[PDB]
Design a protein around this ligand. Structure first.
Ligand SMILES: OC[C@H]1O[C@@H](O)[C@H](O)[C@@H](O)[C@@H]1O
Lengths: 217, 220
């Protein structure tokens, strides 16, 4: 099968900026197609036969390329162009798709507001402990969130969830949830969330000691 | 005008079978090959195969030859896809699309399939309590953790919908347990913490559970 690699996987563009995304093929192809998928909707044909715009696609869009190298270009980025773009070939069987380029709106850097939530008494009664660290309204998305339990860096027991780019201020919000058994939770004292992000001059730490926070015990 | 209507979401257990439909209107059903594509989050798009509704001829991605079965009915303008011997790797959104020949740019709305041996279960709602550990200067954050429910989705509101500003409800994550979990958070002025009451309205109704949990300023 012909493998299509789209670069970059995720990119951000300022308003009015010129944007170009590439679709590379592991073997030569004669034509390239492009589909646009907005979040929570179906893909739609956007460009066909390398350079032909689908009906209703605005004139700022264009595509080009030949052989093993193709590209899609927006002359002037507009907010409605935020979406994921998939390239697709059928010079060889079976037809294959790229993994997509997610194009998002670039805005100024905004440092996250960090909050830490100790586990509720109700959940401790049920025998598990969830510690939640919240990164609110930040940009860009890249953020390093480290859990330390008595200075021990945690691995494999946390999971992150991130919102879509906010429609109004173009920021992201992120939650990191540290899940422990009640037994392991009561075996340690200090629970810390350390956040490293371009908008912070130095990393921010939110932490608590199991015990300076009133509870059932 | 042109319409590709796909059947509703499907929940199945491992090893079971499922058959989904794709009703075409607004164009000559026989004049376009109906392709089927699979989409998982964190994955790209995968081409399964196509059917020529005029002749019934089908071509398959070798990767899906023993998984998918493509049918078409001309009289109802409907194409069908059956997926057998289901595994968790088959949980995805599946689109039908008349990709060839060119002329119709639209795809179907998609059919979401979740295959899981998990049982229907309502969530436990735990407070994400505000306090000094949840306060910057004049802004405080609070929320509700909606944990251990199945299947998707859950709906969360605040103060019966009266509070929408600053609300972030995160996408659900499927835990290794096979149950879903998410948190919904809100930022409020810290001065209003001890005076105004904040309740989250958490709803997951495949289990028909509706819970409103008061999130209260806890003291650290
Ligand atoms: O499908 C690609 C294009 O083919 C043309 O024949 C149609 O007029 C367009 O509506 C369509 O976008």
């Amino acid at each position: 099968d012909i493998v299509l690699t789209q670069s970059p996987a995720i990119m951000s563009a300022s308003p009015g900026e010129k944007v170009t995304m590439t679709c590379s093929a592991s073997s030569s192809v004669s034509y390239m197609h492009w589909y646009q998928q907005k979040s929570g909707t179906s893909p739609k044909r956007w460009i066909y036969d390398t350079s032909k715009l689908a009906s209703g696609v605005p004139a700022r869009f264009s595509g080009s390329g030949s052989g093993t190298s193709y590209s899609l270009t927006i002359s002037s980025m507009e907010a409605e162009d935020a979406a994921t773009y998939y390239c697709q070939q059928w010079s060889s069987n079976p037809p294959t798709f790229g993994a997509g380029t997610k194009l998002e709106l670039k805005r100024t850097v905004a440092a996250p507001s960090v909050f830490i939530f100790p586990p509720s008494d109700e959940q401790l009664k049920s025998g598990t402990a969830s510690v939640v660290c919240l990164l609110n309204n930040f940009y860009p998305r890249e953020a390093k969130v480290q859990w330390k339990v008595d200075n021990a860096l945690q691995s494999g027991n946390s999971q992150e969830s991130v919102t879509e780019q906010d429609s109004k201020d173009s920021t992201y919000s992120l939650s990191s949830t540290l899940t422990l058994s009640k037994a392991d939770y009561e075996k340690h004292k200090v629970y810390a969330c350390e956040v490293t992000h371009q908008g912070l001059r130095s990393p921010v730490t939110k932490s608590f000691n199991r015990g300076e926070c009133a509870a059932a015990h | 005008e042109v319409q590709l209507q796909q059947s509703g979401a499907e929940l199945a257990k491992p090893g079971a079978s499922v058959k989904m439909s794709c009703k075409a209107s607004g164009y000559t059903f026989t004049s376009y090959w109906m392709h089927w594509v699979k989409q998982r989050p964190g994955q790209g798009l995968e081409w399964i195969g196509y059917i020529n509704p005029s002749t019934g001829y089908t071509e398959y991605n070798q990767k899906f030859k023993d998984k998918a079965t493509l049918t078409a009915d001309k009289s109802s303008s409907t194409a069908y896809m059956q997926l057998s011997s289901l595994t968790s790797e088959d949980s995805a959104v599946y689109y039908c699309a008349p990709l060839w020949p060119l002329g119709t740019d639209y795809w179907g709305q998609g059919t979401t399939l979740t295959v899981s041996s998990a049982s229907t279960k309502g969530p436990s709602v735990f407070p994400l309590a505000p306090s000094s550990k949840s306060t910057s200067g004049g802004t405080a954050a609070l929320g509700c953790l909606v944990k251990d429910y199945f299947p998707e989705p859950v709906t969360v509101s605040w103060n019966s919908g009266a509070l929408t500003s600053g609300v972030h409800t995160f996408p659900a994550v499927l835990q290794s347990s096979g149950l879903y979990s998410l948190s919904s958070v809100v930022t409020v002025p810290s001065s209003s913490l001890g005076t105004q009451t904040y309740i989250c309205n958490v709803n997951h109704k495949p289990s028909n559970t509706k819970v409103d949990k008061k999130v209260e300023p806890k003291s650290c």
